[PDB]
Amino acid sequence: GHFSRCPKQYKHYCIKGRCRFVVAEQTPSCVCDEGYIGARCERVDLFY
Amino acid sequence: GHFSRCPKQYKHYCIKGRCRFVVAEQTPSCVCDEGYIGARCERVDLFY
Amino acid sequence: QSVCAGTENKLSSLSDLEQQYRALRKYYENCEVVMGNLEITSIEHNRDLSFLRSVREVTGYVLVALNQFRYLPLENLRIIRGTKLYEDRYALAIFLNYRKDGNFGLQELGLKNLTEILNGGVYVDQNKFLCYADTIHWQDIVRNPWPSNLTLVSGSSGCGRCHKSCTGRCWGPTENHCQTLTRTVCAEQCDGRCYGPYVSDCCHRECAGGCSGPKDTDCFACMNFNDSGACVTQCPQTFVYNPTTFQLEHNFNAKYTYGAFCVKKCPHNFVVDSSSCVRACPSSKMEVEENGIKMCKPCTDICPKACDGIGTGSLMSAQTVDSSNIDKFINCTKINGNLIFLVTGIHGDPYNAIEAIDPEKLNVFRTVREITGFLNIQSWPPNMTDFSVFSNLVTIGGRVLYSGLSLLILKQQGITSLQFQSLKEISAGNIYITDNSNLCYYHTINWTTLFSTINQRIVIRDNRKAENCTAEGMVCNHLCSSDGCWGPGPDQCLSCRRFSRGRICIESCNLYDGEFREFENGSICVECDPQCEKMEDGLLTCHGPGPDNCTKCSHFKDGPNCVEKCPDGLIFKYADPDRECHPCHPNCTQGCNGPTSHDCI
Amino acid sequence: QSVCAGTENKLSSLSDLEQQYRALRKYYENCEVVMGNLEITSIEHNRDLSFLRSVREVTGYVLVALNQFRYLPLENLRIIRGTKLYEDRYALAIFLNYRKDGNFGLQELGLKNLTEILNGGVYVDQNKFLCYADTIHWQDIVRNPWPSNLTLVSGSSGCGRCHKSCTGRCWGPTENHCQTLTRTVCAEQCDGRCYGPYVSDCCHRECAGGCSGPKDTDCFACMNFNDSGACVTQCPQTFVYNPTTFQLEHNFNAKYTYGAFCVKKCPHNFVVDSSSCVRACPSSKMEVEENGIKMCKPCTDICPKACDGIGTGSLMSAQTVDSSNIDKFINCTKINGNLIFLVTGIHGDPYNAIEAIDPEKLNVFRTVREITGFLNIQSWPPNMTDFSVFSNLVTIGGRVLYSGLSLLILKQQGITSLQFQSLKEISAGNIYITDNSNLCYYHTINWTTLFSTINQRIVIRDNRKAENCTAEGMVCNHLCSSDGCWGPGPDQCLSCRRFSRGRICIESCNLYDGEFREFENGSICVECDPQCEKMEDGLLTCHGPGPDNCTKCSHFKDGPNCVEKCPDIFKYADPDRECHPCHPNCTQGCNGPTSHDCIY
Ligand SMILES: *[C@@H]1O[C@H](CO)[C@@H](O[C@@H]2O[C@H](CO)[C@@H](O[C@@H]3O[C@H](CO[C@H]4O[C@H](CO)[C@@H](O)[C@H](O)[C@@H]4O)[C@@H](O)[C@H](O[C@H]4O[C@H](CO)[C@@H](O)[C@H](O)[C@@H]4O)[C@@H]3O)[C@H](O)[C@H]2NC(C)=O)[C@H](O)[C@H]1NC(C)=O
Ligand SMILES: *[C@@H]1O[C@H](CO)[C@@H](O[C@@H]2O[C@H](CO)[C@@H](O[C@@H]3O[C@H](CO[C@H]4O[C@H](CO)[C@@H](O)[C@H](O)[C@@H]4O)[C@@H](O)[C@H](O[C@H]4O[C@H](CO)[C@@H](O)[C@H](O)[C@@H]4O)[C@@H]3O)[C@H](O)[C@H]2NC(C)=O)[C@H](O)[C@H]1NC(C)=O
Ligand SMILES: *[C@@H]1O[C@H](CO)[C@@H](O[C@@H]2O[C@H](CO)[C@@H](O[C@@H]3O[C@H](CO[C@H]4O[C@H](CO)[C@@H](O)[C@H](O)[C@@H]4O)[C@@H](O)[C@H](O[C@H]4O[C@H](CO)[C@@H](O)[C@H](O)[C@@H]4O)[C@@H]3O)[C@H](O)[C@H]2NC(C)=O)[C@H](O)[C@H]1NC(C)=O
Ligand SMILES: *[C@@H]1O[C@H](CO)[C@@H](O[C@@H]2O[C@H](CO)[C@@H](O[C@@H]3O[C@H](CO[C@H]4O[C@H](CO)[C@@H](O)[C@H](O)[C@@H]4O)[C@@H](O)[C@H](O[C@H]4O[C@H](CO)[C@@H](O)[C@H](O)[C@@H]4O)[C@@H]3O)[C@H](O)[C@H]2NC(C)=O)[C@H](O)[C@H]1NC(C)=O
Ligand SMILES: *[C@@H]1O[C@H](CO)[C@@H](O[C@@H]2O[C@H](CO)[C@@H](O[C@@H]3O[C@H](CO[C@H]4O[C@H](CO)[C@@H](O)[C@H](O)[C@@H]4O)[C@@H](O)[C@H](O[C@H]4O[C@H](CO)[C@@H](O)[C@H](O)[C@@H]4O)[C@@H]3O)[C@H](O)[C@H]2NC(C)=O)[C@H](O)[C@H]1NC(C)=O
Ligand SMILES: *[C@@H]1O[C@H](CO)[C@@H](O[C@@H]2O[C@H](CO)[C@@H](O[C@@H]3O[C@H](CO[C@H]4O[C@H](CO)[C@@H](O)[C@H](O)[C@@H]4O)[C@@H](O)[C@H](O[C@H]4O[C@H](CO)[C@@H](O)[C@H](O)[C@@H]4O)[C@@H]3O)[C@H](O)[C@H]2NC(C)=O)[C@H](O)[C@H]1NC(C)=O
Ligand SMILES: *[C@@H]1O[C@H](CO)[C@@H](O[C@@H]2O[C@H](CO)[C@@H](O[C@@H]3O[C@H](CO[C@H]4O[C@H](CO)[C@@H](O)[C@H](O)[C@@H]4O)[C@@H](O)[C@H](O[C@H]4O[C@H](CO)[C@@H](O)[C@H](O)[C@@H]4O)[C@@H]3O)[C@H](O)[C@H]2NC(C)=O)[C@H](O)[C@H]1NC(C)=O
Ligand SMILES: *[C@@H]1O[C@H](CO)[C@@H](O[C@@H]2O[C@H](CO)[C@@H](O[C@@H]3O[C@H](CO)[C@@H](O)[C@H](O)[C@@H]3O)[C@H](O)[C@H]2NC(C)=O)[C@H](O)[C@H]1NC(C)=O
Ligand SMILES: *[C@@H]1O[C@H](CO)[C@@H](O[C@@H]2O[C@H](CO)[C@@H](O[C@@H]3O[C@H](CO)[C@@H](O)[C@H](O)[C@@H]3O)[C@H](O)[C@H]2NC(C)=O)[C@H](O)[C@H]1NC(C)=O
Ligand SMILES: *[C@@H]1O[C@H](CO)[C@@H](O[C@@H]2O[C@H](CO)[C@@H](O[C@@H]3O[C@H](CO)[C@@H](O)[C@H](O)[C@@H]3O)[C@H](O)[C@H]2NC(C)=O)[C@H](O)[C@H]1NC(C)=O
Ligand SMILES: *[C@@H]1O[C@H](CO)[C@@H](O[C@@H]2O[C@H](CO)[C@@H](O[C@@H]3O[C@H](CO)[C@@H](O)[C@H](O)[C@@H]3O)[C@H](O)[C@H]2NC(C)=O)[C@H](O)[C@H]1NC(C)=O
Ligand SMILES: *[C@@H]1O[C@H](CO)[C@@H](O[C@@H]2O[C@H](CO)[C@@H](O)[C@H](O)[C@H]2NC(C)=O)[C@H](O)[C@H]1NC(C)=O
Ligand SMILES: *[C@@H]1O[C@H](CO)[C@@H](O)[C@H](O)[C@H]1NC(C)=O
Ligand SMILES: *[C@@H]1O[C@H](CO)[C@@H](O)[C@H](O)[C@H]1NC(C)=O
């Protein structure tokens, strides 16, 4: 795909989700656990 | 000339000066005494 | 005009692609102006995106990334304002929109009459299957078009040849979908943008993106302000300067400035200041109400202490109360903006090295009576079973809402009771309380006593069952009324019958019994003046305030009052064997025993 | 630009035509903006009017009447603003400019650059030698051209057409002298005025004259504010409204509005309010000074007695203090605008049935501490010899000036002394004091000491000779310093060499002599606490205010001070009246610190 495992300085980047590292933009993003939203998955989703 | 004697309702129009009436415009024109200025000659002249 | 708030996910997503598409529908379906970003990410190769065609203006950035669909149906988008940029650099960013192993990806951008970007860069890159994107003359759309400044246009091969009816710069492969130049074709005498190559084709200075005609009433987007159908630099104010008299004189057509618009009156949650509607008054002035209108004027030498909330003032960058910013609230009675508690605030943040809050620091909020925004609690220390640290809160102001909500609690397992005591008003927005699996007394509350209008609603779901809480004896004091309660205490019910003594509800008052004596009315009881002698064995002592309204005083009687010594102060007086004062001869200040000077000591 | 004030004489004139001409040179020579009316009346046919070529803007109306001269050289006049109108109707009135028994009068108008008249009508009537003005089309020049406005030209034998290149509409016989149309020839796409018939030839909307291009900085004249070369409806204020945060935020480009211009600083005598520089504030606000800047804030339950002067507020229509308006000043302490005393105000005005002021009525001004404008005295009751009715006046503001003057006293023969006491500052403008042939304290005053800038001057052309005043003994009290004195009294001196007891100057103070006692301060002496012993032979017993400052008193001496009686914690006192604490359990009496010392 377009991403790999997060570099060590990002170990705790995402909260209540799984971190992924976008190689072409050198930028982390996260896939959130059920019911969570926001850039680091740190907020609860009201639409759930 | 253009001037006539002032009508009775203008008797006290001029203060420290002589009244003339401008007939074509039915309006007074007041001629001021020594060192006086203004539409009714009521103010002292700062230049003299 | 239909307005929607947008998102702040950047490149993050939900755990399922079907939930990610449904969310995109819920945020952006049936709206035309976005009060934030447009973020379209991870959408599959075969989805209906035709709902995005109604978007005409975007306040923040437009991000299009990691998708697989063939056509981007942004068919009415004219202007991007760029008030927030992707990575603080780009207003439009389109990248990586293809499948790596397969043959799906974005082929045509759409973007029918996009004509203006008012701020930021433009980034179009890594989009494997786009045909026309690299032929577009983006410097006509972008202000400060200087190509060395964040204008990083890339990205494909085997396509990009224009239809014979469009002289290069095509959006698509047909007679339509041709880029129209609005700035680079204008006369050197021209201000802003034009609708043709001549000076007579130039449009008014406060229009953006081009025009139907030359007028401020006849154009495709305003910039600065929309004065009721005309684009303007500012709106007419309450006073004007008269250059011949050297004084300010009252205007006849004044309007209050409000967002990008101008209005005849400010909404009831905004403060009027200097011919504008503002969310908060500056700290140098007191907010007051005059003739039902909120406004502000300079305060007296001692005045209320108000803190910045989360997302405003000195805390503009904060997401939550945490161990670093919580010390700012020590003597505040009012908070301007929001009060928010996220998991990063309560339990710390190991990525940014922010420490968890010591549960004892949260007692710092016991002085606050008003919050002007919303209250948002998503995390709370496990050993704090109630909200007694907020017991003195009176009003939730609701001047700003979190997705329409003003009181919001989710997923608190370590709670049994709420225990608010002073709370009487929730002025705007909805109440949302869910997933509180150990919370009991919530089910008793009469929420229409807290709501300020019939248009307010509450959502309750998946909390502890009321039938299980009743079975366990989770009930309030026997005096508590049908309005319900915050917690088990005799002072924690919304309203009660009989009488109360401050916050505590009581069965009876000290009229003829106990350590002191008082009088009662309207379920309230307060002490009468301590000069009144306490009556015993069921006899009533007091039936009103003061040294008046009682059976008798232990002091000397003097009209409606009583005194420690009858001859004190004073005319002069002496007292009889029942301690009632009667007239004496004047002077005699050493003491008197009767009506005349012969009775003086 | 060179700015001058205009006259307001209408058709009235001086008795001598040489003085009429010399007066006209002195008001209008070497200035380009006339801050009032331009009025040219009764000028002889042999006179030089070339000094009028400097005039470009008139803020009021232009009046040209009863004159003998052939050509009016206003070729570069551009705009008439119409702030006031002649007979409340006309911004330009030209009439009767000929002699009917002879052959002299006005022939050719000049006026080539006249482009905009912002308010009022146009009135050209009963001239004899003026032939070309019938051809001119005023509706291009007049801002309100419709038939409901009084725009009219009334007759001569004629003077042909000016040149073959001029299609009528012309002032004199050349291709140089035909009218530039600026409104009636403009394309229908354009609002305001144009510099040609095409849309590409239109001016910027916020301009009044002609233009070199469609820009706010490239037009000849405008009807609104001048923001550093740009003509604009409003200029940048102290705060700008942020449309995404919904708050007012500080503006680093802010400018103050001041008259018709946008400026960075407001002059020291003006008060700043709401991003503008103004003469006075609303009755709901008080003037305060913070960081050396005067500004206004909402006033509390007690507000200053702000009062309307002559020419402002409820008295804007008034020319003088008089018997119909003098009652409005009875409880006034700060006057906004001027106090002006003319012949009509003092001696009456039978033309309007207004009676003379009863001299006693002038005492309403005894309470005035500040005048924000100017003081102008040209008449006073013959029964008064001084101005002591103003003795409480402290400051003359000078926010408005009378031809540059802020204090003006003309021709008062009854006055022998001025007798101000409280006047310490004249914040702006010059002083002009003349023809007071009986006044003897004008030359002893150190007038530079009342000024608040190096640019202020005093003019004294003639009063009573200093040698005659000296011969009569018209000098101030011996205690008075070199700064001079307002009148003969020791209290009317500007500043005294020895100490003052309030307003009264004295040789020596009651430090150690007399029935009351005082302490020294830097130029004054002030009484001590009455408990303190009145010792002889140089023994001053106090060093400032209060019963704590006394070295020995006839009353009780407690810890911090002398008192008439000590408290009932309860205190007792020794045979020297020195007070000490009793046992706590005392109410009726005590003679010592312990329980057996307490008395009942
Ligand atoms: C690409 O750019 C174009 C402009 O080049 C944008 O066009 C806008 O499209 C909307 C419709 O989606 C237009 O709104 C409609 O305009 C009609 C215009 O009618 C004539 O009269 C005007 C008079 O000024 C002329 O300018 C115009 O050329 C026409 O000759 C109206 O008739 C419509 O109103 C009627 O229909 C509705 C139906 O619900 C009724 O409610 C009304 O009562 C009325 O009967 C309507 O107003 C809009 O005007 C266009 N704007 C511009 C700037 O021209 C596109 O949005 C943009 N994108 C795409 C996908 O094309
Ligand atoms: C300056 O500010 C003014 C407001 O002060 C803005 O006005 C908006 O004008 C646009 C059109 O240019 C409006 O949008 C469309 O209006 C159609 C007509 O209905 C409106 O008008 C009637 C009265 O004439 C009202 O009764 C009615 O409530 C509407 O307000 C509608 O048919 C359109 O809606 C349809 O399409 C959308 C998708 O596009 C669907 O979501 C709808 O369900 C529906 O099918 C649409 O509403 C807009 O409403 C006006 N706003 C306001 C507040 O009046 C100017 O646009 C603005 N100018 C600039 C340059 O910014
Ligand atoms: C939140 O706001 C509260 C007030 O509502 C602030 O609390 C006050 O803080 C001040 C700080 O100066 C305290 O003043 C100091 O108090 C000391 C203790 O006084 C108490 O105990 C004595 C015991 O005899 C009582 O007499 C007294 O009434 C108090 O109950 C004094 O020892 C201090 O005196 C010393 O300092 C002063 C400085 O000027 C010197 O003049 C003295 O000579 C001496 O050296 C001083 O008086 C005050 O007591 C606090 N009040 C309360 C109610 O607790 C918080 O600080 C504020 N928090 C924040 C973060 O802003
Ligand atoms: C002992 O306990 C008694 C109650 O048992 C208390 O009595 C109250 O006394 C106050 C005055 O101190 C009363 O208030 C005044 O009432 C006047 C009469 O009008 C009322 O009564 C008539 C009866 O027919 C009704 O029709 C009418 O609607 C009112 O209810 C008013 O005239 C007074 O207001 C006017 O005068 C004041 C003057 O300052 C102005 O400020 C006002 O603007 C207004 O013009 C005033 O309202 C009160 O009514 C008494 N209550 C009862 C229940 O009788 C005693 O006060 C208490 N002892 C002590 C020491 O406080
Ligand atoms: C009636 O109204 C017209 C139009 O407003 C006035 O026209 C002005 O004419 C004067 C004299 O020519 C101009 O003043 C001079 O401008 C020079 C700059 O060039 C101008 O002309 C070119 C085209 O030829 C334009 O491109 C350019 O923008 C300018 O407009 C300056 O260099 C001159 O300064 C020098 O001379 C003066 C003489 O006093 C010295 O003090 C200086 O130190 C310096 O050496 C001078 O400023 C003026 O600019 C014209 N205005 C306009 C807007 O065109 C008429 O003057 C007026 N009628 C009468 C009778 O005055
Ligand atoms: C907005 O406000 C500005 C000023 O705040 C106005 O511009 C001023 O206009 C006046 C009148 O033209 C200028 O006054 C002249 O000062 C000259 C000084 O020389 C300097 O400035 C001129 C600019 O005109 C330059 O050409 C020159 O190189 C110097 O830098 C004097 O020499 C002038 O005297 C001569 O001309 C006058 C014309 O009135 C004749 O009557 C005299 O006889 C003499 O020959 C003259 O006094 C002033 O300098 C300008 N200030 C500047 C430069 O900003 C704008 O006009 C105003 N905008 C509007 C129209 O709203
Ligand atoms: C008879 O009464 C007179 C007064 O009429 C007493 O005189 C005292 O004189 C001394 C000087 O000799 C005064 O002390 C000085 O006062 C200055 C002003 O302080 C006031 O104003 C400021 C304004 O912001 C306030 O902040 C402040 O609280 C005061 O209200 C101070 O600036 C001086 O401080 C400097 O000097 C001292 C010297 O020890 C240093 O410690 C300081 O760091 C600083 O450098 C100084 O305090 C005093 O105020 C006068 N007192 C009175 C009552 O006014 C006589 O003493 C009195 N005689 C008898 C017999 O009692
Ligand atoms: C929650 O609190 C609300 C607000 O106090 C209570 O609503 C009140 O309901 C009563 C009973 O229905 C209403 O009184 C009745 O009104 C009708 C009006 O036609 C009248 O005919 C009856 O005689 C009687 O007066 C009352 O108006 C209403 N108040 C409001 C503001 O709507 C409600 O009872 C509370 N619920 C509980 C169970 O605590
Ligand atoms: C006996 O009843 C009286 C009322 O008749 C109770 O006291 C008074 O209650 C009224 C409201 O019913 C209070 O009026 C309000 O005061 C606030 C002050 O900020 C004002 O904002 C409101 O607009 C309104 O005027 C009144 O203050 C209050 N008086 C006192 C002294 O508390 C009383 O509590 C009852 N019980 C007993 C035993 O006294
Ligand atoms: C009249 O009032 C003026 C203005 O207040 C007084 O003028 C002042 O004269 C003093 C004389 O001492 C000047 O102070 C200094 O004098 C010394 C002399 O050695 C010199 O070295 C210093 O440079 C300084 O000038 C003071 O500056 C000056 N003030 C002004 C505004 O010029 C004048 O004394 C008053 N009385 C009389 C009798 O004129
Ligand atoms: C001894 O004489 C000096 C003057 O040489 C006196 O000084 C004056 O003290 C007064 C005290 O009120 C100062 O007044 C000021 O008024 C403003 C009003 O807004 C207030 O904000 C200030 O805090 C201040 O009180 C006045 O400026 C000052 N004058 C000078 C020239 O310094 C002093 O009072 C005399 N002492 C005795 C014991 O009489
Ligand atoms: C001041 O007013 C008094 C009157 O109040 C004038 O005194 C009068 O003078 C005339 C002169 O012919 C005498 O006949 C009167 O008897 C005087 N009256 C009194 C009451 O003495 C006095 O002249 C006035 N002074 C000035 C300068 O006008
Ligand atoms: C209610 O109690 C029953 C036992 O009486 C139990 O089975 C059930 O799980 C309880 N429900 C909740 C919500 O605790
Ligand atoms: C000065 O006094 C003399 C008499 O000593 C007198 O003749 C002369 O007129 C007086 N001058 C003035 C100015 O009054």
Residue numbers in the entry:
A (entry chain C), B (entry chain D): 64 to 111
C (entry chain A): 26 to 179, 182 to 597, 604 to 634
D (entry chain B): 26 to 179, 182 to 595, 604 to 635
Source paper text:
To test this hypothesis for HER4 complexes, we determined the cryo-EM structures of full-length HER4 homodimers bound to NRG1β or BTC. In both structures, HER4 kinase domains were bound to afatinib to enable high-resolution reconstruction in the ECD module (3.4 Å for NRG1β, and 3.7 Å for BTC). We present here the first cryo-EM reconstructions of both the homodimer and heterodimer complexes of the HER4 receptor in its full-length form, bound to two different high-affinity HER4 cognate growth factors, NRG1β and BTC. This is also the first time that a betacellulin growth factor has been resolved bound to a HER receptor. The HER4/NRG1β and HER4/BTC homodimers adopt overall similar conformations, but our reconstructions show differences in the intermonomer angles that are adopted by NRG1β- vs BTC-bound homodimers. The two receptors in the HER4/NRG1β dimer adopt an angle of 37 degrees compared to 33 degrees for HER4/BTC. Detailed 3D classification analysis revealed substantial scissor-like movements around the dimerization arm in both data sets with the concerted intermonomer movement of domains I and IV, varying from 35 to 39 degrees for HER4/NRG1β and 30–35 degrees for HER4/BTC. In the HER4/NRG1β pocket, HER4 K438, K35, E112 and D376 form salt bridges with NRG1β E215, D219, R207 and R220, respectively. In the HER4/BTC pocket, HER4 D376 also engages an equivalent BTC R103, but the other three residues are substituted with hydrophobic/polar residues in BTC (NRG1β E215=BTC G98, NRG1β D219=BTC A102, NRG1β R207=BTC T90). Thus, substitutions into small, apolar residues in BTC result in a more ‘compressed’ ligand-binding pocket in HER4/BTC homodimers than in HER4/NRG1β homodimers, which may allosterically determine different intermonomer angles via modulation of dimerization arm positioning. Eight of them are resolved in the cryo-EM maps of both HER4/NRG1β and HER4/BTC homodimers that enabled the building of core glycan trees up to 5 sugar moieties (shown for HER4 /NRG1β).
Human Epidermal growth factor Receptor 4 (HER4 or ERBB4) carries out essential functions in the development and maintenance of the cardiovascular and nervous systems. HER4 activation is regulated by a diverse group of extracellular ligands including the neuregulin (NRG) family and betacellulin (BTC), which promote HER4 homodimerization or heterodimerization with other HER receptors. Important cardiovascular functions of HER4 are exerted via heterodimerization with its close homolog and orphan receptor, HER2. Here, we report cryo-EM structures of near full-length HER2/HER4 heterodimers and full-length HER4 homodimers bound to NRG1β and BTC.
